[PDB]
């Protein structure tokens, strides 16, 4: 029972952890979009 | 007089679109002039707080402005590397002296009314003629950005403070640093000397001994970004006493017209008036919601003005 | 007037590129934390 | 080699699948919260 008990608690909580990882990489993707868009504008204003 | 600013304001003038850098008073007229960071110098009537006019000659942000004794000319400096002279009768630029590389920070007309001093990032202080516009002599010895410069009451002695932690006093005729002071904890930003009516009040304030001539000698003051306001002797170069209690960076200092109190602004969002002779008055008065940049005290009228980064100029009565 | 406005525009562009350099290091930090999180979750699943 | 590879690949794919499940549950919660909020708005606007 003890190991099985951990098998659960010490796992579904770790699935919660990987959900937090999902949130982190979603934020990273949004930051990537900001990266490319800002760089495009900065390159556009080069001639000006 | 025992003129003391009070917490209630009279007018909060907000015409500038950019932070205000310095405010001064016209010598004779009921006019106050405010320079800001948007290359425009505005002219107001402080008695009624009415916008009078604006001068938009400068290219980059205007840093420092100064009148002459007669109030007929207005010297201005900006980050556009140039010094403009304004005819105050018709309010148009009449002579724009160039040179003095990189951002010019301070400018002042010594009371003789024929020459101008100027200080800038190029670590030197240039002398110009009002009539012609030729830089006749250049003062070197500061190793860093010279921030603020002020002459004496008769056009012979000059003080230059800089980021280099040194305040240097220069002589018109000899072009030599007679007194060099390197004692401040952090950068010195603002300086102002003592009028006549205050020298006597210093003698019992510090206990200094008169020389053979008997004159206490010319005086300095320097406020430094280390939150310290130190008042100094021209003849000797030694500390008399130090003012401590400013929360944040000090930006402007000047003496009360009566030569009895000390009025100073700082980045602490507040204006502090302090006594020095017996350390009784320590009045702190919140002035602006944001950083407070500069202030000025009227010579005779019971009015003071403060310009801040909030693009707002405020007027306080004196009581 | 023209020189004033051009100077303001140049200052804005310089501030823009400085903020672009800040955005890059922010993105670097985000990537690092995403990495640590995902690795932790993977090996906790490995434990279980 | 065969069985251990099954292990690794499918276990990691199931970690991918628990990440998918966490994403779906987050979306469902967001949707349920929006449902409750809009229902409150409607019962407030009934009188209008």
Curated annotation (Swiss-Prot), chains A, D:
Location of N6-acetyllysine modifications: 43
Gene label: DYNC1H1
Complex formation: Homodimer. The cytoplasmic dynein 1 complex consists of two catalytic heavy chains (HCs) and a number of non-catalytic subunits presented by intermediate chains (ICs), light intermediate chains (LICs) and light chains (LCs); the composition seems to vary in respect to the IC, LIC and LC composition. The heavy chain homodimer serves as a scaffold for the probable homodimeric assembly of the respective non-catalytic subunits. The ICs and LICs bind directly to the HC dimer and dynein LCs assemble on the IC dimer. Interacts with DYNC1LI1; DYNC1LI1 and DYNC1LI2 bind mutually exclusive to DYNC1H1.
Organism lineage string: Eukaryota, Metazoa, Chordata, Craniata, Vertebrata
Protein name, entry field: Cytoplasmic dynein 1 heavy chain 1
Illness association: Charcot-Marie-Tooth disease, axonal, type 2O: An axonal form of Charcot-Marie-Tooth disease, a disorder of the peripheral nervous system, characterized by progressive weakness and atrophy, initially of the peroneal muscles and later of the distal muscles of the arms. Charcot-Marie-Tooth disease is classified in two main groups on the basis of electrophysiologic properties and histopathology: primary peripheral demyelinating neuropathies (designated CMT1 when they are dominantly inherited) and primary peripheral axonal neuropathies (CMT2).
Function: Cytoplasmic dynein 1 acts as a motor for the intracellular retrograde motility of vesicles and organelles along microtubules. Dynein has ATPase activity; the force-producing power stroke is thought to occur on release of ADP. Plays a role in mitotic spindle assembly and metaphase plate congression.
Localisation: Cytoplasm, Cytoskeleton
Domains as described in the record: Dynein heavy chains probably consist of an N-terminal stem (which binds cargo and interacts with other dynein components), and the head or motor domain. The motor contains six tandemly-linked AAA domains in the head, which form a ring. A stalk-like structure (formed by two of the coiled coil domains) protrudes between AAA 4 and AAA 5 and terminates in a microtubule-binding site. A seventh domain may also contribute to this ring; it is not clear whether the N-terminus or the C-terminus forms this extra domain.
Family: Belongs to the dynein heavy chain family.
Swiss-Prot record, chain B:
WD-type repeats, residues: 15-56, 57-96, 99-138, 141-180, 183-242, 245-286, 287-319
Region of interest (Interaction with DCX), residue spans: 276-318
Pathological condition linked to this protein in its record: Lissencephaly 1: A classical lissencephaly. It is characterized by agyria or pachygyria and disorganization of the clear neuronal lamination of normal six-layered cortex. The cortex is abnormally thick and poorly organized with 4 primitive layers. Associated with enlarged and dysmorphic ventricles and often hypoplasia of the corpus callosum. Subcortical band heterotopia: SBH is a mild brain malformation of the lissencephaly spectrum. It is characterized by bilateral and symmetric plates or bands of gray matter found in the central white matter between the cortex and cerebral ventricles, cerebral convolutions usually appearing normal.
Compartment annotation: Cytoplasm, Cytoskeleton; Cytoplasm, Cytoskeleton, Microtubule organizing center, Centrosome; Cytoplasm, Cytoskeleton, Spindle; Nucleus membrane
Region (Interaction with NDEL1), start-end ranges: 297-319
Keyword Cell cycle carried by entry: yes
Family: Belongs to the WD repeat LIS1/nudF family.
Alphabetically ordered keywords of this record: Acetylation, Cell cycle, Cell division, Coiled coil, Cytoplasm, Cytoskeleton, Developmental protein, Differentiation, Disease variant, Lipid degradation, Lipid metabolism, Lissencephaly, Membrane, Microtubule, Mitosis, Neurogenesis, Nucleus, Phosphoprotein, Repeat, Transport, WD repeat
Other remarks in the entry: Originally the subunits of the type I platelet-activating factor (PAF) acetylhydrolase was named alpha (PAFAH1B1), beta (PAFAH1B2) and gamma (PAFAH1B3). Now these subunits have been renamed beta (PAFAH1B1), alpha2 (PAFAH1B2) and alpha1 (PAFAH1B3) respectively.
UniProt keyword Cell inner membrane present: no
Principal subcellular localization: cytoplasm
Function field: Regulatory subunit (beta subunit) of the cytosolic type I platelet-activating factor (PAF) acetylhydrolase (PAF-AH (I)), an enzyme that catalyzes the hydrolyze of the acetyl group at the sn-2 position of PAF and its analogs and participates in PAF inactivation. Regulates the PAF-AH (I) activity in a catalytic dimer composition-dependent manner. Required for proper activation of Rho GTPases and actin polymerization at the leading edge of locomoting cerebellar neurons and postmigratory hippocampal neurons in response to calcium influx triggered via NMDA receptors.
Record-level GO cellular component terms: 1-alkyl-2-acetylglycerophosphocholine esterase complex; astral microtubule; axon cytoplasm; cell cortex; cell leading edge; central region of growth cone; centrosome; cytoplasmic microtubule
Region (Interaction with dynein and dynactin): 1-319
Tissues in which the protein is found: Fairly ubiquitous expression in both the frontal and occipital areas of the brain.
One of the record's GO molecular function terms: dynein complex binding
Domain of life the protein comes from: Eukaryota
Effect on the protein upon substituting residue 150 to P: In SBH; somatic mosaicism in 18% of lymphocytes and 21% of hair root cells
Phosphoserine modifications at: 18
Domain notes from UniProt: Dimerization mediated by the LisH domain may be required to activate dynein.
């Amino acid at each position: 029972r003890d190991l099985e008990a951990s098998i659960a608690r010490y796992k579904e909580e770790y699935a919660v952890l990987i959900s937090e990882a999902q949130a982190i990489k979603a934020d990273l993707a949004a930051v990537e979009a900001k990266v490319n868009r800002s760089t495009a504008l900065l390159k556009s204003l080069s001639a000006e | 007089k025992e003129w003391i600013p009070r917490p209630p304001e009279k007018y909060a003038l907000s015409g500038h679109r950019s932070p205000v850098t310095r405010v001064i008073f016209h010598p004779v007229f009921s006019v106050m002039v405010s320079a800001s960071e948007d290359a425009t110098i505005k002219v107001w009537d402080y008695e009624t707080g009415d916008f009078e006019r604006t001068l938009k000659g400068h290219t980059d942000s205007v840093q420092d402005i100064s009148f002459d004794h007669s109030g007929k000319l207005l010297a201005s400096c900006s980050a556009d590397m140039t010094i403009k002279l304004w005819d105050f009768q018709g309010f148009e630029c009449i002579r724009t002296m160039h040179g003095h590389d990189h951002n010019v920070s301070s400018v002042a007309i010594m009371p003789n009314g024929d020459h101008i001093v100027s200080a800038s990032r190029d670590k030197t202080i240039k002398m110009w003629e009002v009539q012609t516009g030729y830089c006749v002599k250049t003062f070197t010895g500061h190793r860093e950005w010279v921030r603020m410069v002020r002459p004496n009451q008769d056009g012979t002695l000059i003080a230059s403070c800089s980021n280099d932690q040194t305040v240097r006093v220069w002589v018109v005729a000899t072009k030599e640093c007679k007194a060099e002071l390197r004692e401040h904890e952090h950068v010195v930003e603002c300086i102002s000397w003592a009028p006549e009516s205050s020298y006597s009040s210093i003698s019992e304030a510090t206990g200094s001994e008169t020389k053979k001539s008997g004159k206490p000698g010319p005086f300095l003051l320097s406020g430094s970004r280390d939150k310290t306001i130190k008042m100094w002797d021209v003849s000797t170069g030694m500390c008399l006493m130090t003012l401590v209690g400013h929360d944040n960076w000090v930006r402007g200092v000047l003496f009360h017209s009566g030569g009895k109190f000390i009025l100073s602004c700082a980045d602490d969002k507040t204006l502090r008036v302090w006594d020095y002779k017996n350390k009784r008055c320590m009045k702190t008065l919140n002035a602006h919601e944001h950083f407070v940049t500069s202030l000025d005290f009227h010579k005779t009228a019971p009015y003071v003005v403060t310009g801040s980064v909030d693009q707002t100029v405020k007027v306080w009565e004196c009581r | 007037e023209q020189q004033m406005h051009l100077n303001v525009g140049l200052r804005k562009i310089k501030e823009t590129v400085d903020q672009v350099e800040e955005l890059r290091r922010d993105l670097r930090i985000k990537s690092q934390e995403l990495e640590v999180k995902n690795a932790a979750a993977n090996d906790k699943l490995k434990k279980m």
